[PDB]
Coordinates of N, CA, C and O and ligand atoms in Angstrom, one line a residue:
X1 N -76.8 21.4 -84.0 CA -75.5 22.0 -84.4 C -74.4 20.9 -84.7 O -74.4 19.9 -84.0
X2 N -73.5 21.2 -85.6 CA -72.5 20.3 -86.0 C -71.4 20.3 -84.8 O -71.2 21.4 -84.3
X3 N -70.8 19.2 -84.5 CA -69.9 19.2 -83.4 C -68.6 20.0 -83.9 O -68.3 20.0 -85.1
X4 N -67.9 20.6 -82.9 CA -66.7 21.3 -83.3 C -65.5 20.5 -83.7 O -64.6 21.0 -84.4
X5 N -65.5 19.2 -83.3 CA -64.4 18.3 -83.7 C -64.9 17.2 -84.5 O -66.0 16.7 -84.4
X6 N -64.0 16.6 -85.4 CA -64.4 15.5 -86.2 C -64.2 14.2 -85.3 O -64.0 14.3 -84.1
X7 N -64.4 13.1 -86.0 CA -64.2 11.8 -85.3 C -62.8 11.8 -84.8 O -61.9 12.2 -85.4
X8 N -62.6 11.2 -83.6 CA -61.3 11.0 -83.0 C -60.5 10.0 -83.7 O -61.1 8.9 -84.1
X9 N -59.2 10.2 -83.9 CA -58.4 9.2 -84.6 C -58.4 8.0 -83.7 O -58.5 8.1 -82.5
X10 N -58.2 6.8 -84.3 CA -58.2 5.6 -83.5 C -57.3 5.7 -82.3 O -57.7 5.3 -81.2
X11 N -56.1 6.2 -82.5 CA -55.1 6.4 -81.5 C -55.5 7.3 -80.4 O -55.1 7.2 -79.2
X12 N -56.4 8.3 -80.7 CA -56.9 9.2 -79.7 C -58.2 8.9 -79.0 O -58.7 9.6 -78.1
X13 N -58.8 7.8 -79.5 CA -60.1 7.4 -79.0 C -60.2 7.2 -77.5 O -61.2 7.6 -76.9
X14 N -59.2 6.7 -76.9 CA -59.2 6.5 -75.4 C -58.3 7.5 -74.7 O -58.1 7.4 -73.5
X15 N -57.9 8.6 -75.3 CA -57.1 9.6 -74.7 C -58.1 10.8 -74.3 O -59.2 10.9 -74.9
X16 N -57.7 11.6 -73.3 CA -58.5 12.7 -72.8 C -58.3 13.8 -73.9 O -57.2 14.0 -74.4
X17 N -59.3 14.6 -74.1 CA -59.3 15.7 -75.0 C -59.1 17.0 -74.2 O -59.9 17.3 -73.3
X18 N -58.0 17.7 -74.4 CA -57.7 18.9 -73.7 C -57.8 20.2 -74.5 O -57.1 20.4 -75.5
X19 N -58.7 21.1 -74.1 CA -59.0 22.3 -74.7 C -58.0 23.3 -74.1 O -58.1 23.6 -72.9
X20 N -57.1 23.9 -74.9 CA -56.1 24.8 -74.5 C -56.3 26.2 -75.0 O -56.4 26.5 -76.2
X21 N -56.3 27.2 -74.0 CA -56.4 28.6 -74.3 C -55.1 29.2 -74.8 O -54.0 28.7 -74.6
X22 N -55.2 30.3 -75.6 CA -54.0 31.0 -76.1 C -53.5 32.2 -75.3 O -52.5 32.1 -74.6
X23 N -54.3 33.2 -75.3 CA -53.9 34.5 -74.6 C -53.9 34.4 -73.1 O -54.9 34.1 -72.5
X24 N -52.7 34.8 -72.6 CA -52.4 34.8 -71.2 C -52.3 33.4 -70.6 O -52.1 33.2 -69.4
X25 N -52.4 32.4 -71.4 CA -52.2 31.0 -71.0 C -50.9 30.4 -71.6 O -50.1 29.9 -70.8
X26 N -50.7 30.5 -72.9 CA -49.5 30.0 -73.5 C -48.6 31.2 -73.9 O -47.4 31.0 -74.0
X27 N -49.2 32.3 -74.2 CA -48.4 33.5 -74.6 C -49.1 34.8 -74.1 O -50.1 34.7 -73.4
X28 N -48.5 35.9 -74.4 CA -49.0 37.2 -74.0 C -48.6 38.1 -75.2 O -47.4 38.3 -75.5
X29 N -49.6 38.7 -75.9 CA -49.4 39.6 -77.0 C -49.7 41.0 -76.7 O -50.5 41.3 -75.8
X30 N -49.2 42.0 -77.5 CA -49.5 43.4 -77.3 C -49.1 44.2 -78.6 O -48.3 43.8 -79.4
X31 N -49.8 45.4 -78.7 CA -49.5 46.2 -79.8 C -48.4 47.2 -79.5 O -47.7 47.7 -80.4
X32 N -48.1 47.4 -78.2 CA -47.0 48.3 -77.8 C -45.7 47.5 -77.8 O -45.7 46.4 -77.2
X33 N -44.7 48.0 -78.5 CA -43.4 47.4 -78.6 C -42.9 46.8 -77.2 O -43.0 47.5 -76.2
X34 N -42.4 45.6 -77.3 CA -41.8 45.0 -76.1 C -40.4 44.4 -76.5 O -40.3 43.9 -77.6
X35 N -39.5 44.7 -75.6 CA -38.1 44.2 -75.9 C -38.0 42.7 -75.7 O -38.6 42.1 -74.7
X36 N -37.3 42.0 -76.6 CA -37.1 40.6 -76.5 C -38.3 39.7 -76.8 O -38.5 38.6 -76.3
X37 N -39.2 40.2 -77.6 CA -40.4 39.5 -78.0 C -40.0 38.2 -78.8 O -38.9 38.2 -79.4
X38 N -40.8 37.2 -78.7 CA -40.5 35.9 -79.4 C -41.0 36.0 -80.8 O -40.3 35.5 -81.7
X39 N -42.2 36.5 -81.0 CA -42.8 36.7 -82.3 C -43.2 38.1 -82.5 O -43.7 38.7 -81.6
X40 N -43.1 38.6 -83.7 CA -43.5 40.0 -84.0 C -44.1 39.9 -85.4 O -43.4 39.9 -86.4
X41 N -45.4 39.7 -85.5 CA -46.1 39.4 -86.7 C -47.1 40.5 -87.1 O -47.6 41.3 -86.3
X42 N -47.4 40.6 -88.4 CA -48.4 41.6 -88.9 C -49.8 41.0 -88.9 O -50.1 39.9 -89.2
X43 N -50.7 41.9 -88.4 CA -52.1 41.5 -88.3 C -52.9 42.7 -88.9 O -52.8 43.9 -88.4
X44 N -53.8 42.4 -89.9 CA -54.6 43.5 -90.5 C -55.8 43.8 -89.7 O -56.6 42.9 -89.4
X45 N -56.1 45.0 -89.4 CA -57.2 45.5 -88.7 C -57.8 46.7 -89.3 O -57.2 47.8 -89.3
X46 N -59.0 46.5 -89.9 CA -59.7 47.6 -90.6 C -58.9 48.2 -91.7 O -58.9 49.4 -92.0
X47 N -58.1 47.3 -92.4 CA -57.3 47.7 -93.5 C -55.9 48.2 -93.2 O -55.2 48.7 -94.1
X48 N -55.6 48.2 -92.0 CA -54.2 48.7 -91.6 C -53.4 47.6 -90.9 O -53.9 46.9 -90.0
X49 N -52.2 47.4 -91.4 CA -51.3 46.4 -90.9 C -50.6 46.8 -89.6 O -49.8 47.8 -89.6
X50 N -50.8 46.1 -88.5 CA -50.2 46.5 -87.2 C -49.2 45.4 -86.8 O -49.5 44.2 -87.2
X51 N -48.2 45.7 -86.1 CA -47.2 44.7 -85.7 C -47.7 44.3 -84.3 O -48.0 45.1 -83.5
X52 N -47.7 43.0 -84.1 CA -48.1 42.4 -82.9 C -46.9 41.7 -82.2 O -46.4 40.8 -82.8
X53 N -46.6 42.1 -81.0 CA -45.4 41.6 -80.3 C -45.9 40.4 -79.4 O -46.7 40.7 -78.4
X54 N -45.4 39.2 -79.6 CA -45.8 38.1 -78.9 C -44.7 37.5 -78.0 O -43.6 37.3 -78.5
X55 N -45.0 37.3 -76.7 CA -44.0 36.7 -75.8 C -44.5 35.3 -75.4 O -45.6 35.2 -75.0
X56 N -43.6 34.4 -75.5 CA -43.9 33.0 -75.1 C -43.7 32.8 -73.6 O -42.8 33.3 -73.0
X57 N -44.6 32.0 -73.0 CA -44.6 31.7 -71.6 C -43.5 30.7 -71.3 O -43.3 29.8 -72.1
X58 N -42.7 30.9 -70.3 CA -41.6 30.0 -70.0 C -42.1 28.5 -70.0 O -43.2 28.2 -69.4
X59 N -41.3 27.7 -70.6 CA -41.6 26.2 -70.7 C -42.8 25.9 -71.6 O -43.3 24.7 -71.5
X60 N -43.1 26.7 -72.5 CA -44.3 26.4 -73.4 C -43.9 25.3 -74.4 O -44.7 24.5 -74.8
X61 N -42.6 25.3 -74.8 CA -42.2 24.3 -75.8 C -42.2 22.9 -75.1 O -42.8 21.9 -75.7
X62 N -41.7 22.8 -73.9 CA -41.7 21.5 -73.2 C -43.1 21.1 -72.9 O -43.5 19.9 -73.0
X63 N -44.0 22.1 -72.6 CA -45.4 21.8 -72.3 C -46.1 21.3 -73.4 O -46.7 20.2 -73.3
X64 N -46.1 22.0 -74.6 CA -46.8 21.5 -75.8 C -46.4 20.2 -76.3 O -47.2 19.4 -76.7
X65 N -45.1 20.0 -76.3 CA -44.6 18.7 -76.8 C -45.1 17.5 -75.9 O -45.6 16.5 -76.5
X66 N -45.0 17.7 -74.6 CA -45.5 16.7 -73.7 C -47.0 16.5 -73.8 O -47.5 15.4 -73.8
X67 N -47.8 17.6 -73.7 CA -49.2 17.5 -73.8 C -49.7 16.8 -75.1 O -50.6 16.0 -75.1
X68 N -49.0 17.2 -76.2 CA -49.3 16.6 -77.5 C -49.2 15.1 -77.5 O -49.9 14.4 -78.2
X69 N -48.3 14.5 -76.6 CA -48.0 13.1 -76.5 C -49.1 12.4 -75.7 O -49.5 11.3 -75.9
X70 N -49.5 13.2 -74.6 CA -50.5 12.6 -73.7 C -51.9 12.7 -74.1 O -52.7 11.8 -73.8
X71 N -52.4 13.8 -74.7 CA -53.8 14.0 -75.0 C -54.1 14.4 -76.4 O -53.3 14.7 -77.2
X72 N -55.4 14.4 -76.7 CA -55.9 14.8 -78.0 C -56.1 16.3 -77.7 O -57.1 16.8 -77.3
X73 N -55.0 17.1 -78.0 CA -55.0 18.5 -77.8 C -55.8 19.4 -78.8 O -55.7 19.1 -80.0
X74 N -56.5 20.4 -78.3 CA -57.2 21.3 -79.2 C -57.1 22.7 -78.8 O -57.3 23.1 -77.6
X75 N -56.6 23.6 -79.7 CA -56.5 25.0 -79.4 C -57.9 25.6 -79.5 O -58.6 25.4 -80.5
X76 N -58.3 26.3 -78.5 CA -59.7 26.9 -78.5 C -59.5 28.3 -77.9 O -59.3 28.5 -76.7
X77 N -59.5 29.3 -78.8 CA -59.3 30.7 -78.4 C -60.5 31.6 -78.7 O -61.3 31.2 -79.7
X78 N -60.7 32.7 -78.0 CA -61.8 33.6 -78.3 C -61.3 34.7 -79.3 O -62.1 35.6 -79.6
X79 N -60.0 34.6 -79.7 CA -59.5 35.6 -80.6 C -59.7 35.2 -82.1 O -60.2 34.0 -82.3
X80 N -59.5 36.1 -83.0 CA -59.6 35.8 -84.4 C -58.5 35.0 -85.0 O -57.3 35.1 -84.6
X81 N -58.8 34.1 -86.0 CA -57.7 33.3 -86.6 C -56.6 34.1 -87.3 O -55.5 33.6 -87.3
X82 N -56.9 35.3 -87.8 CA -55.9 36.1 -88.5 C -54.7 36.3 -87.6 O -53.6 36.7 -88.0
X83 N -55.0 36.2 -86.3 CA -54.0 36.4 -85.3 C -53.5 35.1 -84.7 O -52.3 34.7 -84.7
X84 N -54.5 34.3 -84.1 CA -54.2 33.0 -83.5 C -53.5 32.0 -84.4 O -52.6 31.3 -84.0
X85 N -53.9 31.9 -85.7 CA -53.4 30.9 -86.6 C -51.9 31.0 -86.7 O -51.1 30.0 -86.5
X86 N -51.4 32.2 -87.1 CA -49.9 32.4 -87.3 C -49.2 32.1 -86.0 O -48.1 31.5 -86.0
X87 N -49.8 32.5 -84.9 CA -49.1 32.2 -83.6 C -49.1 30.7 -83.3 O -48.0 30.2 -82.8
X88 N -50.1 30.0 -83.6 CA -50.2 28.6 -83.4 C -49.2 27.9 -84.3 O -48.5 26.9 -84.0
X89 N -49.0 28.5 -85.5 CA -48.0 27.9 -86.5 C -46.6 28.0 -85.9 O -45.8 27.1 -86.1
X90 N -46.3 29.1 -85.3 CA -45.0 29.3 -84.7 C -44.8 28.5 -83.4 O -43.7 28.1 -83.0
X91 N -45.9 28.3 -82.7 CA -45.9 27.5 -81.4 C -45.8 26.0 -81.5 O -44.8 25.4 -81.0
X92 N -46.7 25.4 -82.2 CA -46.8 24.0 -82.4 C -45.8 23.4 -83.4 O -46.1 23.3 -84.6
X93 N -44.7 22.9 -82.9 CA -43.7 22.3 -83.8 C -43.7 20.8 -83.7 O -42.9 20.1 -84.3
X94 N -44.7 20.3 -83.0 CA -44.9 18.8 -82.8 C -46.3 18.3 -83.3 O -46.6 17.2 -83.1
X95 N -47.1 19.2 -83.8 CA -48.4 18.8 -84.3 C -49.2 18.4 -83.1 O -50.0 17.4 -83.2
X96 N -49.0 19.1 -82.0 CA -49.7 18.7 -80.7 C -51.2 19.0 -80.9 O -52.0 18.3 -80.4
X97 N -51.5 20.1 -81.6 CA -52.9 20.5 -81.8 C -53.6 19.7 -82.9 O -53.3 19.8 -84.1
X98 N -54.6 18.9 -82.5 CA -55.3 18.0 -83.4 C -56.3 18.9 -84.2 O -56.7 18.6 -85.3
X99 N -56.7 20.0 -83.6 CA -57.6 20.9 -84.2 C -57.5 22.3 -83.6 O -57.0 22.5 -82.5
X100 N -57.9 23.3 -84.4 CA -57.8 24.7 -83.9 C -59.2 25.4 -84.0 O -59.8 25.4 -85.1
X101 N -59.7 25.9 -82.9 CA -61.0 26.6 -82.9 C -60.8 28.0 -82.4 O -60.1 28.3 -81.5
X102 N -61.5 28.9 -83.1 CA -61.4 30.4 -82.8 C -62.7 31.0 -82.3 O -63.6 30.4 -82.0
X103 N -62.7 32.4 -82.4 CA -63.8 33.2 -81.9 C -65.2 32.6 -82.3 O -66.1 32.5 -81.4
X104 N -65.4 32.4 -83.6 CA -66.8 31.9 -84.1 C -67.3 30.6 -83.4 O -68.5 30.4 -83.4
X105 N -66.4 29.8 -82.9 CA -66.7 28.6 -82.3 C -67.2 28.7 -80.9 O -67.8 27.8 -80.3
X106 N -67.0 29.9 -80.3 CA -67.4 30.2 -78.9 C -68.9 30.6 -79.0 O -69.4 31.0 -80.0
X107 N -69.6 30.5 -77.9 CA -71.0 30.9 -77.8 C -71.0 32.2 -77.0 O -70.6 32.3 -75.8
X108 N -71.5 33.3 -77.6 CA -71.6 34.6 -76.9 C -72.7 34.5 -75.9 O -73.9 35.0 -76.2
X109 N -72.4 34.0 -74.7 CA -73.4 33.9 -73.6 C -73.3 34.9 -72.5 O -72.2 35.0 -71.8
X110 N -74.3 35.7 -72.3 CA -74.4 36.7 -71.3 C -73.2 37.6 -71.4 O -72.5 37.8 -70.3
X111 N -72.9 38.1 -72.5 CA -71.7 39.0 -72.7 C -70.3 38.5 -72.8 O -69.4 39.3 -72.9
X112 N -70.2 37.2 -72.7 CA -68.8 36.6 -72.7 C -68.7 35.5 -73.8 O -69.6 34.8 -74.1
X113 N -67.5 35.3 -74.3 CA -67.2 34.3 -75.2 C -66.9 33.0 -74.5 O -65.8 32.7 -74.0
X114 N -68.0 32.1 -74.4 CA -67.9 30.9 -73.6 C -67.5 29.7 -74.5 O -67.9 29.6 -75.7
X115 N -66.7 28.8 -74.0 CA -66.3 27.6 -74.7 C -67.1 26.5 -74.1 O -66.8 25.9 -73.1
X116 N -68.2 26.1 -74.8 CA -69.1 25.1 -74.4 C -68.5 23.7 -74.8 O -68.5 23.3 -75.9
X117 N -68.0 23.0 -73.8 CA -67.4 21.7 -73.9 C -68.3 20.7 -74.5 O -67.8 19.8 -75.2
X118 N -69.6 20.7 -74.2 CA -70.5 19.7 -74.7 C -70.6 19.8 -76.2 O -70.9 18.8 -76.9
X119 N -70.1 20.9 -76.7 CA -70.0 21.2 -78.2 C -68.9 20.5 -78.9 O -68.9 20.4 -80.1
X120 N -68.0 19.9 -78.2 CA -66.8 19.2 -78.8 C -67.1 17.9 -79.4 O -66.6 17.5 -80.4
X121 N -68.0 17.1 -78.8 CA -68.3 15.8 -79.3 C -67.4 14.8 -78.7 O -67.1 13.8 -79.3
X122 N -67.1 15.0 -77.4 CA -66.2 14.1 -76.6 C -66.9 13.8 -75.3 O -67.7 14.7 -74.8
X123 N -66.6 12.6 -74.7 CA -67.2 12.2 -73.5 C -66.7 13.2 -72.4 O -65.5 13.3 -72.2
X124 N -67.6 13.9 -71.7 CA -67.2 14.8 -70.7 C -66.4 14.2 -69.5 O -65.7 15.0 -68.8
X125 N -66.4 12.9 -69.3 CA -65.6 12.3 -68.3 C -64.2 12.2 -68.8 O -63.3 11.9 -68.1
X126 N -64.0 12.6 -70.1 CA -62.7 12.5 -70.7 C -62.3 13.9 -71.4 O -61.7 13.9 -72.4
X127 N -62.7 15.0 -70.8 CA -62.4 16.3 -71.3 C -61.9 17.2 -70.2 O -62.4 17.3 -69.1
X128 N -60.9 18.0 -70.6 CA -60.3 19.0 -69.7 C -60.1 20.3 -70.5 O -60.0 20.3 -71.7
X129 N -60.2 21.5 -69.8 CA -60.0 22.7 -70.4 C -59.0 23.5 -69.6 O -59.1 23.6 -68.3
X130 N -58.0 24.1 -70.2 CA -57.0 24.9 -69.6 C -57.2 26.3 -70.1 O -56.8 26.6 -71.2
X131 N -57.7 27.1 -69.2 CA -58.0 28.5 -69.6 C -57.8 29.4 -68.4 O -58.3 29.1 -67.3
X132 N -57.1 30.5 -68.5 CA -56.9 31.4 -67.4 C -58.2 32.2 -67.0 O -58.2 32.9 -66.0
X133 N -59.2 32.1 -67.8 CA -60.5 32.8 -67.5 C -61.6 31.8 -67.2 O -62.2 31.2 -68.1
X134 N -62.0 31.7 -65.9 CA -63.1 30.8 -65.5 C -64.4 31.1 -66.2 O -65.3 30.3 -66.3
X135 N -64.5 32.4 -66.7 CA -65.7 32.8 -67.4 C -65.9 31.9 -68.7 O -67.0 31.7 -69.1
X136 N -64.8 31.5 -69.2 CA -64.7 30.7 -70.4 C -65.4 29.4 -70.3 O -66.0 28.9 -71.3
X137 N -65.4 28.8 -69.1 CA -66.0 27.5 -68.9 C -67.1 27.5 -67.8 O -67.2 26.6 -67.0
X138 N -68.0 28.5 -67.9 CA -69.1 28.6 -67.0 C -70.0 27.4 -67.0 O -70.6 27.1 -65.9
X139 N -70.1 26.7 -68.1 CA -71.0 25.5 -68.2 C -70.3 24.3 -67.7 O -71.0 23.3 -67.3
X140 N -69.0 24.3 -67.6 CA -68.2 23.1 -67.2 C -67.1 23.4 -66.1 O -66.0 23.1 -66.4
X141 N -67.5 23.9 -65.0 CA -66.5 24.3 -63.9 C -65.7 23.1 -63.4 O -64.6 23.2 -62.9
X142 N -66.3 21.9 -63.6 CA -65.6 20.7 -63.1 C -64.7 19.9 -64.1 O -64.2 18.9 -63.8
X143 N -64.5 20.5 -65.3 CA -63.7 20.0 -66.3 C -62.4 20.9 -66.5 O -61.6 20.6 -67.3
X144 N -62.3 21.9 -65.6 CA -61.2 22.8 -65.7 C -60.0 22.5 -64.8 O -60.1 22.0 -63.7
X145 N -58.8 22.8 -65.4 CA -57.6 22.7 -64.7 C -57.1 24.1 -64.5 O -56.6 24.8 -65.4
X146 N -57.4 24.7 -63.3 CA -57.0 26.1 -63.1 C -55.6 26.5 -63.5 O -54.7 25.7 -63.3
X147 N -55.4 27.6 -64.0 CA -54.1 28.1 -64.5 C -54.0 29.6 -64.4 O -54.9 30.4 -64.8
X148 N -52.9 30.1 -63.9 CA -52.6 31.5 -63.7 C -52.4 32.3 -65.0 O -51.8 31.8 -65.9
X149 N -52.9 33.5 -65.0 CA -52.8 34.4 -66.2 C -51.3 34.9 -66.2 O -50.8 35.3 -65.2
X150 N -50.7 34.8 -67.4 CA -49.3 35.2 -67.5 C -49.2 36.4 -68.4 O -49.9 36.6 -69.4
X151 N -48.2 37.3 -68.1 CA -48.0 38.5 -68.9 C -46.5 38.7 -69.3 O -46.2 39.0 -70.4
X152 N -45.6 38.5 -68.3 CA -44.2 38.7 -68.6 C -43.2 38.3 -67.6 O -42.0 38.6 -67.6
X153 N -43.7 37.5 -66.6 CA -42.8 37.0 -65.5 C -42.0 35.8 -66.1 O -42.5 34.7 -66.1
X154 N -40.7 36.1 -66.4 CA -39.9 35.0 -67.0 C -39.5 34.0 -65.9 O -38.9 33.0 -66.2
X155 N -40.0 34.2 -64.7 CA -39.7 33.3 -63.6 C -40.9 32.4 -63.4 O -40.9 31.5 -62.5
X156 N -41.9 32.6 -64.2 CA -43.2 31.8 -64.2 C -42.9 30.3 -64.5 O -42.1 30.0 -65.4
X157 N -43.5 29.4 -63.7 CA -43.2 28.0 -63.9 C -44.5 27.1 -64.0 O -44.5 25.9 -64.0
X158 N -45.6 27.8 -64.1 CA -46.9 27.2 -64.1 C -47.1 26.0 -65.1 O -47.5 25.0 -64.8
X159 N -46.7 26.3 -66.4 CA -46.8 25.2 -67.4 C -45.9 24.0 -67.0 O -46.4 22.9 -67.1
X160 N -44.7 24.3 -66.4 CA -43.9 23.2 -66.0 C -44.5 22.5 -64.8 O -44.5 21.2 -64.7
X161 N -45.1 23.2 -63.9 CA -45.7 22.6 -62.7 C -47.0 21.9 -63.0 O -47.4 21.0 -62.2
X162 N -47.6 22.3 -64.1 CA -48.9 21.6 -64.4 C -48.7 20.2 -65.1 O -49.6 19.4 -65.0
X163 N -47.6 20.0 -65.7 CA -47.4 18.7 -66.3 C -47.6 17.5 -65.4 O -48.2 16.5 -65.7
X164 N -47.0 17.6 -64.2 CA -47.2 16.5 -63.2 C -48.6 16.2 -63.0 O -49.0 15.0 -62.9
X165 N -49.4 17.2 -62.9 CA -50.9 17.1 -62.6 C -51.6 16.5 -63.8 O -52.6 15.7 -63.7
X166 N -51.2 16.9 -65.0 CA -51.8 16.4 -66.3 C -51.4 14.9 -66.4 O -52.1 14.1 -67.0
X167 N -50.2 14.6 -66.0 CA -49.7 13.2 -66.1 C -50.6 12.4 -65.3 O -51.1 11.3 -65.7
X168 N -51.0 12.8 -64.1 CA -51.9 12.1 -63.2 C -53.2 11.9 -63.8 O -53.7 10.8 -63.9
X169 N -53.8 13.0 -64.3 CA -55.1 13.0 -65.0 C -55.1 12.0 -66.2 O -56.1 11.4 -66.5
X170 N -54.0 11.9 -66.9 CA -54.0 11.1 -68.1 C -54.1 9.6 -67.7 O -54.3 8.7 -68.6
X171 N -54.0 9.3 -66.4 CA -54.2 7.9 -66.0 C -55.5 7.5 -65.3 O -55.7 6.3 -65.0
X172 N -56.4 8.4 -65.1 CA -57.6 8.1 -64.5 C -58.7 7.8 -65.5 O -58.6 8.0 -66.7
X173 N -59.8 7.1 -65.0 CA -60.9 6.7 -65.9 C -61.8 7.9 -66.1 O -62.4 8.1 -67.2
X174 N -62.0 8.7 -65.1 CA -63.0 9.9 -65.1 C -62.3 11.1 -64.4 O -62.0 11.0 -63.2
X175 N -62.2 12.2 -65.2 CA -61.6 13.4 -64.6 C -62.4 14.0 -63.4 O -61.8 14.7 -62.6
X176 N -63.7 13.7 -63.4 CA -64.5 14.2 -62.3 C -64.1 13.6 -61.0 O -64.3 14.2 -59.9
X177 N -63.6 12.4 -61.0 CA -63.2 11.8 -59.7 C -62.1 12.6 -59.1 O -61.9 12.6 -57.9
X178 N -61.3 13.3 -59.9 CA -60.2 14.2 -59.4 C -60.7 15.6 -59.3 O -60.6 16.2 -58.2
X179 N -61.3 16.2 -60.3 CA -61.8 17.5 -60.3 C -63.1 17.7 -59.5 O -63.5 18.8 -59.1
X180 N -63.7 16.6 -59.2 CA -64.9 16.4 -58.3 C -66.4 16.7 -58.7 O -67.1 17.4 -57.9
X181 N -67.0 16.0 -59.7 CA -68.4 16.2 -60.0 C -69.0 14.9 -60.7 O -69.7 15.1 -61.7
Ligands
MG201 MG1 -56.9 33.8 -72.1

């Protein structure tokens, strides 16, 4: 199989590659109207245009800008591009995402959309995945940075609290020495 990512830019060759999830990690979307939504976009489903209300997780702007500076960031979602692409366009104002991967790039393993990290084409000692669903990284439990699922708690500070830990990881030679494998 062809790797999911191209050759790393010279500047990113020695940086860690971070696979970042979309739903319940950076945002929370819904078909039922929500007051004070950040994005309200059209998504076609079976020929009918539906309005999708998207809420941004607190501190996502600070998070993405910082992560984009520290690592070779990659958006990897199990959702379809017709939805994720527009959301990513509205989210990434710093070109933090070096690449965007959707549903088709996941491997449907034992009923779940798994994100096979070996599939990226990056040294596993230099790869991290931020996903609220441990099922997503069943093949790479030791490359994960645990993160809580978010829905609408505007008091949430997980993204802000995770930066210190990512800062730490950006300075180690092998993420396994920290995550432990
Ligand atoms: Mg998710």
